Amino acid sequence: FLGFLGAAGSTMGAASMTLTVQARNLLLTVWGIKQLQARVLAVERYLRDQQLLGIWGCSGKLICCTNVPWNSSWSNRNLSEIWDNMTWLQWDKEISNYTQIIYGLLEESQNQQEKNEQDLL
Amino acid sequence: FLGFLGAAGSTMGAASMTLTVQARNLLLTVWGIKQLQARVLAVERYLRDQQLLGIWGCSGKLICCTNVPWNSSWSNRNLSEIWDNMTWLQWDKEISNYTQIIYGLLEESQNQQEKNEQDLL
Amino acid sequence: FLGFLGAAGSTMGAASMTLTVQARNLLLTVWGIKQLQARVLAVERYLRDQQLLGIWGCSGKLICCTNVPWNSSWSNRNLSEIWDNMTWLQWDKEISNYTQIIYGLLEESQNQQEKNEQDLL
Amino acid sequence: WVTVYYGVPVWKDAETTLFCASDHNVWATHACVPTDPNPQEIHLENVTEEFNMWKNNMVEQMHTDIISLWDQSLKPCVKLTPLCVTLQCTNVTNNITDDMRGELKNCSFNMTTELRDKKQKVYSLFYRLDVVQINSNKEYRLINCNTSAITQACPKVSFEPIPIHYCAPAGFAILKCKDKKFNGTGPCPSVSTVQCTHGIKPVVSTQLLLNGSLAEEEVMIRSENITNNAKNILVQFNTPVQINCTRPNNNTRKSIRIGPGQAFYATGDIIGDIRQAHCNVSKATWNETLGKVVKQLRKHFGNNTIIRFANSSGGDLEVTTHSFNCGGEFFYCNTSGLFNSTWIDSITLPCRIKQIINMWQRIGQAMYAPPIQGVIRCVSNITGLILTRDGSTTETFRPGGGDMRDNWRSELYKYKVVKIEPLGVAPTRCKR
Amino acid sequence: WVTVYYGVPVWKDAETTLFCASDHNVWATHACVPTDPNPQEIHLENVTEEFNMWKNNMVEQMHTDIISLWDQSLKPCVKLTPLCVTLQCTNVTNNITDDMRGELKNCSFNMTTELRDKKQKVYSLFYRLDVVQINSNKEYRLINCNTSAITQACPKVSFEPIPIHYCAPAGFAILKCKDKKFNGTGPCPSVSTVQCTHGIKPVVSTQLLLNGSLAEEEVMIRSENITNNAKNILVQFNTPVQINCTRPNNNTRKSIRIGPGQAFYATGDIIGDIRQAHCNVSKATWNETLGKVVKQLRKHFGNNTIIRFANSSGGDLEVTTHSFNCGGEFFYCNTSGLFNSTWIDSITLPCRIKQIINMWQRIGQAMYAPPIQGVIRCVSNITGLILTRDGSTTETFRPGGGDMRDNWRSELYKYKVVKIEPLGVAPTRCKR
Ligand SMILES: *[C@@H]1O[C@H](CO)[C@@H](O[C@@H]2O[C@H](CO)[C@@H](O[C@@H]3O[C@H](CO)[C@@H](O)[C@H](O[C@H]4O[C@H](CO)[C@@H](O)[C@H](O)[C@@H]4O)[C@@H]3O)[C@H](O)[C@H]2NC(C)=O)[C@H](O)[C@H]1NC(C)=O
Ligand SMILES: *[C@@H]1O[C@H](CO)[C@@H](O[C@@H]2O[C@H](CO)[C@@H](O[C@@H]3O[C@H](CO)[C@@H](O)[C@H](O[C@H]4O[C@H](CO)[C@@H](O)[C@H](O)[C@@H]4O)[C@@H]3O)[C@H](O)[C@H]2NC(C)=O)[C@H](O)[C@H]1NC(C)=O
Ligand SMILES: *[C@@H]1O[C@H](CO)[C@@H](O[C@@H]2O[C@H](CO)[C@@H](O)[C@H](O)[C@H]2NC(C)=O)[C@H](O)[C@H]1NC(C)=O
Ligand SMILES: *[C@@H]1O[C@H](CO)[C@@H](O[C@@H]2O[C@H](CO)[C@@H](O)[C@H](O)[C@H]2NC(C)=O)[C@H](O)[C@H]1NC(C)=O
Ligand SMILES: *[C@@H]1O[C@H](CO)[C@@H](O[C@@H]2O[C@H](CO)[C@@H](O)[C@H](O)[C@H]2NC(C)=O)[C@H](O)[C@H]1NC(C)=O
Ligand SMILES: *[C@@H]1O[C@H](CO)[C@@H](O[C@@H]2O[C@H](CO)[C@@H](O)[C@H](O)[C@H]2NC(C)=O)[C@H](O)[C@H]1NC(C)=O
Ligand SMILES: *[C@@H]1O[C@H](CO)[C@@H](O[C@@H]2O[C@H](CO)[C@@H](O)[C@H](O)[C@H]2NC(C)=O)[C@H](O)[C@H]1NC(C)=O
Ligand SMILES: *[C@@H]1O[C@H](CO)[C@@H](O[C@@H]2O[C@H](CO)[C@@H](O)[C@H](O)[C@H]2NC(C)=O)[C@H](O)[C@H]1NC(C)=O
Ligand SMILES: *[C@@H]1O[C@H](CO)[C@@H](O[C@@H]2O[C@H](CO)[C@@H](O)[C@H](O)[C@H]2NC(C)=O)[C@H](O)[C@H]1NC(C)=O
Ligand SMILES: *[C@@H]1O[C@H](CO)[C@@H](O)[C@H](O)[C@H]1NC(C)=O
Ligand SMILES: *[C@@H]1O[C@H](CO)[C@@H](O)[C@H](O)[C@H]1NC(C)=O
Ligand SMILES: *[C@@H]1O[C@H](CO)[C@@H](O)[C@H](O)[C@H]1NC(C)=O
Ligand SMILES: *[C@@H]1O[C@H](CO)[C@@H](O)[C@H](O)[C@H]1NC(C)=O
Ligand SMILES: *[C@@H]1O[C@H](CO)[C@@H](O)[C@H](O)[C@H]1NC(C)=O
Ligand SMILES: *[C@@H]1O[C@H](CO)[C@@H](O)[C@H](O)[C@H]1NC(C)=O
Ligand SMILES: *[C@@H]1O[C@H](CO)[C@@H](O)[C@H](O)[C@H]1NC(C)=O
Ligand SMILES: *[C@@H]1O[C@H](CO)[C@@H](O)[C@H](O)[C@H]1NC(C)=O
Ligand SMILES: *[C@@H]1O[C@H](CO)[C@@H](O)[C@H](O)[C@H]1NC(C)=O
Ligand SMILES: *[C@@H]1O[C@H](CO)[C@@H](O)[C@H](O)[C@H]1NC(C)=O
Ligand SMILES: *[C@@H]1O[C@H](CO)[C@@H](O)[C@H](O)[C@H]1NC(C)=O
Ligand SMILES: *[C@@H]1O[C@H](CO)[C@@H](O)[C@H](O)[C@H]1NC(C)=O
Ligand SMILES: *[C@@H]1O[C@H](CO)[C@@H](O)[C@H](O)[C@H]1NC(C)=O
Ligand SMILES: *[C@@H]1O[C@H](CO)[C@@H](O)[C@H](O)[C@H]1NC(C)=O
Ligand SMILES: *[C@@H]1O[C@H](CO)[C@@H](O)[C@H](O)[C@H]1NC(C)=O
Ligand SMILES: *[C@@H]1O[C@H](CO)[C@@H](O)[C@H](O)[C@H]1NC(C)=O
Ligand SMILES: *[C@@H]1O[C@H](CO)[C@@H](O)[C@H](O)[C@H]1NC(C)=O
Ligand SMILES: *[C@@H]1O[C@H](CO)[C@@H](O)[C@H](O)[C@H]1NC(C)=O
Ligand SMILES: *[C@@H]1O[C@H](CO)[C@@H](O)[C@H](O)[C@H]1NC(C)=O
Ligand SMILES: *[C@@H]1O[C@H](CO)[C@@H](O)[C@H](O)[C@H]1NC(C)=O
Ligand SMILES: *[C@@H]1O[C@H](CO)[C@@H](O)[C@H](O)[C@H]1NC(C)=O
Ligand SMILES: *[C@@H]1O[C@H](CO)[C@@H](O)[C@H](O)[C@H]1NC(C)=O
Ligand SMILES: *[C@@H]1O[C@H](CO)[C@@H](O)[C@H](O)[C@H]1NC(C)=O
Ligand SMILES: *[C@@H]1O[C@H](CO)[C@@H](O)[C@H](O)[C@H]1NC(C)=O
């Protein structure tokens, strides 16, 4: 089918089947420095996202189901609109202002279960 | 016992007990650039293999058991020959032409179970 | 509350609730080389610790419960002293001489269960 | 309810460092990544993206990269410091036509030798634009002597504008707008993702854009603000106009040793007749082309408006003329024969030649262009114009230029660089 | 059935960048990684690996690294441009022996001073190989004046060939062939993995290989193609031949200031008698050694074949003689006394000395070697030869050389660089 970003205009539930397509595309001394800086940055950006998935308990996954409830104030829409009408670019704009709140909540719930799992052992 | 690559001449099942031995060995401005390029490359190569294990569902493991059947056309041999007679260098030559097919199948089966696991939750 | 290293003077069990605080802080051509070397090193140090957690079976976790027994010769103290009186800086000094022994044991027990888990499948 | 996805096809505008790739150059030689023989392009269905060619930092990057590469290619070459001497000059009158009477000067001077103890008397030909009369009526100095050091370009490095492909680093992507009739700003449909840009030739010129790409259907007028007379108008042709330029003088070159391992390349006597350099533009083609340009200008200025073309305003030769580099020599051609009309064989444009070149718009770094032996003939495509509007029933357009960024903006207008942001969250209906 | 393993002991041939490590140098100083005091070597049981010393890119890398380090060590040193002047020269006849009559010249010249307004008359001794007669029968110039600029090596940086260890970057490994009687190509058993190479001394020489490693059991003959007379033969001895070289002239040095913070080091009058530089090779040792070489050549050419040794062919001094650098001075010794025999005290080889050196095989970068005070005595090991076969019942062997890669290929022949490929799959009998 289409490769990298081919699903960009597709709906969210049509997309999200192509997650490995995008994940794999994230990987004279003056020209040397410019190229190394570009390569070092690609590595650093990749690792920051991986660390973040790790602290949320989603390490090694592309689709991670969490234990944080959705607040209707973040987006009062049903699943039919979100997954069948909207694209990911549109969604990202709609909930931009709630991203940091959601991220904080994801970290907190992982810390709590990580500890509960120790008490049960 | 022997360290890095010590098991190279050993059979596949004698080897594969030494996986941590090899895994741990993967980690004037002109000399500066040459050394940084070597270090940056070592990091990039390491991360590509880790990403690949991740999309196959083998993150965090050295021995990963998958859900893809073996096609006898890739190598029509039994377990006794593969694990007790052959070395890993010999095996790699024998199935070189099927590596990309196998990798594609591993990615596909992970995508399918990753989705089934969401429907069950 | 306090941020990075804020818990440094806290006891071990008061600390160890702040693990994500510290984990997130680990991330003219001559000035170019100096800065790149600092950035490349930060990446390499991060990855060595992650590889090590991986071979011990603790990938993706901040608190990992293992299957290696504690030898009283490493530190003959009870849990009350270790978790309620001591700080992590004090503890690190107390068991510095046993760190490599413990690390070797952690690798060995993971290799054994990684293999047992294959036989059971 | 909250679920986390990684690998989500989302992006944001971004500014990054792009690297060069390509299939004895001034620019890209071995410090350039070999290209992919089968590069990818992915059409994005249902994607509308906003582009703005006037805010495109790929242009600023290219400008910086070509200047830096230019300098690195002069750095190891011969310094001509010993040449800034008093010259004794007379006129070249041997078989000189009227068109060049007084254009070439025959100058003698006392040059250094391999040995510090000895001097040599040598002579060479210079163009009048390369020298300044001082004081003794035959005494001259080179034009750059009171301004800057001059170096000689190494005569092994060509100036041929071999194309460069710009490629994005991982985590970034280049989006291409394929919408025909795209005027440089606003949204456009028909967006595709590419690994790298097409090959863009770093052709350096003023007034007329040479050897670039063509418009897909019709002549297009692009500007930052079409009603602002302080802004330039870039005109892209949908058909080329062929232009043939030449220096019809059989030159010879001589090497003067000036030091232990260094030599100056001087122009020797001209073989045969001496004639003026010039460029030929087919008249009918130019007239048809200009036809199309006016038809499109009227869309912005009125279809009952009188549109006049006029030659350039006064100022520095580097701006008022059509500058280009061909065959290894720098030409300054007079375009008043192209821009002289109300509304809308061959047209011959006379040209001047210089040896001392101040590149870009810098002061302090001059270069000497070694002469080229034999006769130079160039054939190239005019692919567009840079116009400035002079300004209630009529408008006057004149040739403009000199700011090299306008010559790259015309090729990079289709590209945008974005950053990929693979994480996202959404509600779903599952629970860990 | 499919299972995935990570950390699999598999490798492929690869080409990468190796870094230098080591335990006022030209080469490795502080830009070199300190070595591991207890380096590892791992024997690989049951591993057969194919090696090819003639396709080993470690050789190309070493060649590039040593040339670049060489240049970086001359870059900050004094330029001798002011020295390329007319010299007034006479002969040194004071206590001169017959062997050197006409070899040294006493030259006077007008040199610059710290102050731009003043000149000084100075004199120094030069070897006849450093100067060219011009025109006035006493007028000379330095040999490099019509070719290249010359710089003076800084007399604080020694040329002593301190050993360099090459180490692989992570993800790569160096395999060593320990198979005795390994001729450079084909498979060999007894392969071990090492972190780094042993220390290899960047000794620069022609014809005779000095101070290298020895063969483990017997003299070995190695070539790319033993039947191709266009290829060189590398001969590795299993025993050293000791060679003693000297310059028996008590020289003195004088410093001539030539500018504000710069000085030229000149050779002053020679103290005592003036005698020819030479090298001594024990005759019996040479004869036994040559014995062993022929015995082995016969394995490829026939045991009833007549093998003759002859001196070098004509050509540039740098090729036809045995060049080496010892004590800080560059010697050119005549080896016709070593290669003059059919089949198979001391042998004295006369030598010439030069001050102006064109390194490697480059043109354009010359260096002046400051003179060394006192008397030079060197003791070194001949560890092998570079031979060329001149070619129906006989073969003639002559000394060869000049291509420095042949001097490193002789130490790096045991090493191969491979890339580790840790992933692999195999059938097993389990199911996720
Ligand atoms: C617009 O594009 C056209 C073509 O796409 C381009 O014209 C080309 O210019 C080059 C350079 O002037 C021409 O190539 C030269 O042709 C002459 C013919 O006698 C040769 O002598 C030249 O070779 C010498 O110089 C070389 C420099 O490295 C040396 O390597 C060589 O040994 C010789 O010394 C050289 O081949 C080329 O033929 C034309 N192309 C065509 C189709 O005519 C034009 O210049 C571009 N316009 C601008 C303004 O850049
Ligand atoms: C083959 O290997 C042998 C040894 O392995 C090597 O011989 C060594 O050469 C060096 C350089 O000629 C000798 O060291 C010198 O000895 C003289 C004796 O009077 C000293 O004066 C020298 O010191 C001066 O120069 C130094 C340079 O940095 C200064 O730092 C110092 O202050 C002095 O100015 C210097 O010590 C060394 O002794 C010999 N070794 C032996 C055993 O004789 C030989 O050259 C190698 N062959 C080749 C061709 O490289
Ligand atoms: C430029 O001037 C030089 C002299 O400075 C001319 O060269 C001389 O031409 C005459 C003609 O017979 C010769 O006899 C001389 O020997 C030439 N002098 C040298 C130094 O070669 C030269 O021809 C003039 N060039 C032009 C184009 O007018
Ligand atoms: C460019 O070419 C034109 C055409 O040859 C030159 O035009 C002449 O300019 C002088 C200046 O007053 C006029 O008197 C002539 O009548 C003009 N000729 C024509 C046909 O118009 C023009 O000067 C050239 N420009 C430059 C800067 O040299
Ligand atoms: C001037 O423009 C024409 C038209 O674009 C160029 O000729 C085309 O070159 C492409 C190269 O692949 C061919 O596919 C086209 O078929 C050509 N068109 C025609 C009509 O032949 C021409 O090469 C350009 N000239 C220069 C000097 O670049
Ligand atoms: C620099 O000067 C030397 C010495 O005159 C030139 O080398 C001579 O070239 C002639 C050409 O026929 C030979 O016959 C001589 O034997 C050469 N002499 C030596 C010592 O080799 C050299 O060619 C000159 N270099 C340049 C660039 O002109
Ligand atoms: C080289 O020539 C110089 C002169 O150019 C000789 O130096 C002179 O030697 C006489 C001997 O009594 C002294 O009186 C002079 O004062 C010396 N001149 C200078 C400038 O010192 C020098 O000895 C000659 N060297 C050799 C080796 O012959
Ligand atoms: C190298 O040394 C040999 C031996 O001293 C020199 O050989 C002499 O060469 C001349 C040239 O014709 C002969 O006439 C002599 O008879 C040779 N002597 C002997 C003993 O054979 C040789 O010339 C030297 N090589 C160089 C390049 O100087
Ligand atoms: C010439 O070769 C001999 C033989 O390899 C070198 O002497 C050996 O040096 C090693 C260094 O560890 C000792 O272990 C050997 O026992 C030595 N052999 C003998 C017979 O003593 C000698 O140093 C070499 N000479 C030079 C100048 O490198
Ligand atoms: C949902 O968000 C609002 C503010 O936007 C907050 O007050 C409310 O408590 C949130 N719901 C829950 C369950 O926390
Ligand atoms: C639920 O889906 C229906 C489909 O028509 C839509 O009209 C309704 O507004 C959606 N719910 C919300 C909260 O918007
Ligand atoms: C096994 O491979 C062959 C081709 O090599 C293919 O046709 C066959 O369908 C494969 N088996 C399965 C179960 O897909
Ligand atoms: C199975 O193992 C036996 C052992 O002798 C071997 O002969 C046989 O060929 C093997 N099976 C296959 C498919 O080769
Ligand atoms: C505990 O450590 C001691 C040495 O410090 C060792 O002898 C003992 O066997 C260890 N205990 C176990 C269970 O291995
Ligand atoms: C256990 O805790 C008590 C608390 O007072 C302490 O006294 C005792 O020494 C501890 N055990 C060990 C092994 O030190
Ligand atoms: C002009 O050209 C002719 C062509 O042969 C030549 O003979 C004549 O000498 C030239 N005139 C001068 C002054 O060089
Ligand atoms: C050269 O020609 C120009 C043309 O105007 C004239 O003014 C000048 O005086 C001439 N120079 C000489 C040296 O004759
Ligand atoms: C060269 O120097 C001499 C010295 O007398 C002078 O006469 C002559 O005019 C100079 N040559 C030139 C072209 O200035
Ligand atoms: C370019 O197209 C956009 C599309 O809306 C339009 O707004 C803009 O004014 C156009 N540019 C000019 C110069 O008219
Ligand atoms: C275009 O230029 C006119 C000239 O004054 C100015 O008023 C207008 O605001 C400019 N357009 C924009 C979008 O700023
Ligand atoms: C340019 O030269 C070509 C032949 O190379 C010719 O056909 C064309 O008409 C010329 N153009 C002009 C404007 O003379
Ligand atoms: C433009 O044409 C006029 C006609 O009089 C002329 O005077 C002027 O110098 C020309 N300008 C340029 C830059 O050629
Ligand atoms: C410009 O057009 C006028 C119209 O009469 C013509 O006379 C004049 O020569 C033209 N100028 C040029 C430079 O061709
Ligand atoms: C230039 O003159 C020389 C003289 O023989 C001739 O051979 C050469 O072909 C001429 N060059 C041209 C381009 O006509
Ligand atoms: C030759 O050496 C002796 C040794 O004392 C010395 O006296 C004599 O002057 C020297 N000869 C010359 C010409 O220097
Ligand atoms: C120097 O000695 C050589 C030996 O052949 C002789 O030819 C030369 O003329 C001598 N030079 C002087 C200046 O006497
Ligand atoms: C130094 O310059 C003077 C100036 O008259 C000259 O006579 C003398 O010969 C020069 N010296 C040399 C060695 O050339
Ligand atoms: C080197 O040994 C290999 C081993 O087979 C042999 O084929 C090769 O010909 C030998 N080299 C020479 C020069 O004989
Ligand atoms: C060795 O050289 C001979 C000389 O012609 C050639 O025929 C032969 O093919 C060469 N050996 C190889 C392996 O190419
Ligand atoms: C070299 O010198 C040593 C003593 O340092 C001596 O024993 C040896 O025989 C000499 N070699 C020759 C060839 O003279
Ligand atoms: C080799 O020996 C011969 C003997 O006649 C001699 O002529 C020749 O010059 C010598 N060659 C070299 C390079 O020494
Ligand atoms: C070479 O051997 C011959 C044999 O007669 C001898 O005369 C000659 O002097 C030798 N040459 C050298 C340079 O020793
Ligand atoms: C060189 O001569 C000086 C003069 O006193 C003497 O002291 C020194 O030892 C001599 N050098 C040698 C190596 O004999």
The CA distance from D371 to E99, in Å, is 53
Ligand 32 atom nearest to E311, measured from its CA: 13
CB atoms B69 and E11 under 8 Å? no
Instruction: Give which of E254, E257, E331, E330 is closest to E83, Cα–Cα.
Output: E257
Which chain D residue is nearest to residue A96, measuring alpha carbons? D424
CB atoms within 10 A of CB D97: 11
Residue the block writes with tokens 């005091």: E37
The CA distance from E26 to E71, in Å, is 9
Residue E249 and residue E423 in contact, taking contact as beta carbons nearer than 8 Å:
no
Residue the block writes with tokens 């036994």: E288
Instruction: Output the CA angle D111-D112-D117, nearest 5 degrees.
Output: 135
CB atoms within 10 A of CB D42: 18
Distance from CA of D155 to the nearest CA of E (A): 16
Q: 3-state DSSP call for residue D15?
A: coil
A25: which chain D residues are within 8 Å (Cβ-Cβ)?
170-171, 173, 420
Give the residues across from D389 on adjacent strands: D397
The CA distance from A39 to A32, in Å, is 11
Q: Kindly calculate the radius of gyration of chain E based on its CA atoms and give it in whole angstroms.
A: 26
Q: Do chains D and B touch (3 or more CB pairs under 8 A)?
A: yes
The CA distance from E359 to E361, in Å, is 6
What count of Cα atoms within 13 Å lies in the side-chain half-sphere of residue D18? 30
Q: Collect all residues with Cβ–Cβ distance below 8 Å to A40 and sequence separation of at least 6.
A: B40, C36, C39, C40, C43
Residue the block writes with tokens 């004199």: E123
Q: 3-state DSSP call for residue E328?
A: coil
Residue E40 and residue B3 in contact, taking contact as beta carbons nearer than 8 Å:
yes
Q: Which long-range contacts (CB under 8 A, 24 or more apart) does A74-79 make?
A: A74/A98, A74/A101, A74/A102, A75/D427, A79/D427, A79/D428, A79/D429
CB atoms D422 and A49 under 8 Å? yes
For the record, the structure tokens of E208 come out as 């005779």
Strand order in the sheet with E119-127: E119-127, E104-112, E87-91, E139-142, E131-133
DSSP state of C83: I
The CA distance from E115 to D216, in Å, is 69
Residue the block writes with tokens 């190569």: B45
Instruction: Give which of B106, A20, A82 is closest to D3, Cα–Cα.
Output: A82
What's the sign of the alpha-carbon dihedral A111, A113, A117, A118?
Answer: positive
DSSP state of E224: S
Q: Which of B55, B105, B107 to mutate to test the interface with A (most CBs of A within 10 A)?
A: B55
Ligand 26 atom nearest to E137, measured from its CA: 13
Residues followed by a gap in chain E, C→N > 2.5 Å: 23, 135, 344, 391
Distance from CA of C96 to the nearest CA of A (A): 25
- B116 to chain D, any CB pair closer than 8 A? The answer is no
CB atoms E47 and B9 under 8 Å? yes
For the record, the structure tokens of D221 come out as 């007028």
Buried b (16+ CB within 10 A) or exposed e, D105-114: bbbebebbbb
The preferred substitution site among D111, D120, D121 for testing ligand 18, maximizing ligand atoms within 8 Å of CB, is D121
Residue the block writes with tokens 């004639």: D275
Instruction: Give which of E319, E317, E326 is closest to E378, Cα–Cα.
Output: E326
Residue D41 and residue D192 in contact, taking contact as beta carbons nearer than 8 Å:
yes
CA of E85 to the centre of ligand 27 (A): 11
A49: which chain D residues are within 8 Å (Cβ-Cβ)?
6, 422-423
Domain boundaries defined on chain B: 1-121
- For helices B29-55 and A29-55, angle between their N-to-C axes, nearest 10 degrees: 30
Residue the block writes with tokens 């799959």: E425
CA of D102 to the centre of ligand 4 (A): 17
Q: What is the length of chain D?
A: 432
The CA distance from E232 to B65, in Å, is 55
For the record, the structure tokens of E405 come out as 């890669």
Q: What is the length of chain C?
A: 121
Q: Report residues whose beta carbon is within 6 angstroms of any ligand 29 atom.
A: E 225, 227-228
Query: Within E73-175, where are the H helices?
Result: none
Q: 3-state DSSP call for residue B57?
A: coil
H/E stretch holding A37 reads helix A29-55
Backbone angles phi, psi at E126, to 5 degrees: -125, 155
Instruction: Output the CA angle D308-D309-D315, nearest 5 degrees.
Output: 130
Give the residues across from D221 on adjacent strands: D235
What count of Cα atoms within 13 Å lies in the side-chain half-sphere of residue D404? 20
The preferred substitution site among D320, D339, D340, D347 for testing ligand 23, maximizing ligand atoms within 8 Å of CB, is D340
CA E372 to chain CA centroid, nearest Å? 20
Residue D39 and residue A102 in contact, taking contact as beta carbons nearer than 8 Å:
no
DSSP state of D355: S
CA D403 to chain CA centroid, nearest Å? 9
Residue the block writes with tokens 């290219």: D62
Q: Is the CB of D186 under 6 A from ligand 19?
A: yes
Which chain A residue is nearest to residue D21, measuring alpha carbons? A35
Ligand closest to Cα of E349 equals: 8
Q: Which amino acid is at D261?
A: G
Solved with: cryo-EM
Ligand closest to Cα of E106 equals: 7
Distance from CA of C114 to the nearest CA of B (A): 7
Instruction: Output the CA angle D72-D73-D76, nearest 5 degrees.
Output: 85
Q: Is the CB of A80 under 6 A from ligand 11?
A: yes
Torsion of CA E61, E65, E71, E74, to 10 degrees: -160
What's the sign of the alpha-carbon dihedral A55, A61, A66, A72?
Answer: positive
Query: Within B29-94, where are the H helices?
Result: 29-55, 79, 88-94
CB atoms within 10 A of CB E230: 8
The CA distance from D384 to D400, in Å, is 12
Residue D142 and residue D132 in contact, taking contact as beta carbons nearer than 8 Å:
yes
- For helices C29-55 and B29-55, angle between their N-to-C axes, nearest 10 degrees: 30
Give the residues across from D250 on adjacent strands: D271
Q: Which of D116, D154, D255 to mutate to test the interface with E (most CBs of E within 10 A)?
A: D116
Residue E158 and residue E140 in contact, taking contact as beta carbons nearer than 8 Å:
no
CA A118 to chain CA centroid, nearest Å? 27
CB atoms within 10 A of CB C90: 12
CA E151 to chain CA centroid, nearest Å? 21
Q: Kindly calculate the radius of gyration of chain D based on its CA atoms and give it in whole angstroms.
A: 26
Instruction: Output the CA angle E204-E151-E71, nearest 5 degrees.
Output: 50
Beta-strand pair E220-223/E322-326: unpaired
Instruction: Give which of E397, E405, E409, E413 is closest to E226, Cα–Cα.
Output: E397
Torsion of CA E297, E301, E304, E306, to 10 degrees: -70
Query: Within E261-419, where are the H helices?
Result: 283-301, 317-320, 406-412
The CA distance from D183 to D18, in Å, is 24
What's the sign of the alpha-carbon dihedral A45, A50, A51, A55?
Answer: positive
Residue D417 and residue D16 in contact, taking contact as beta carbons nearer than 8 Å:
yes
Q: Kindly calculate the radius of gyration of chain B based on its CA atoms and give it in whole angstroms.
A: 18
DSSP E230-283: TSEEEEEEEEEEEEEEEEEEEE-EEEEEEETTEEEEEE-PPBS-B---EEEE-H
CA E81 to chain CA centroid, nearest Å? 28
CB atoms within 10 A of CB B96: 9
DSSP A74-100: T----HIIIIII-BHHHHHHHTGGGHH
For the record, the structure tokens of D354 come out as 């210089």
H/E stretch holding C36 reads helix C29-55
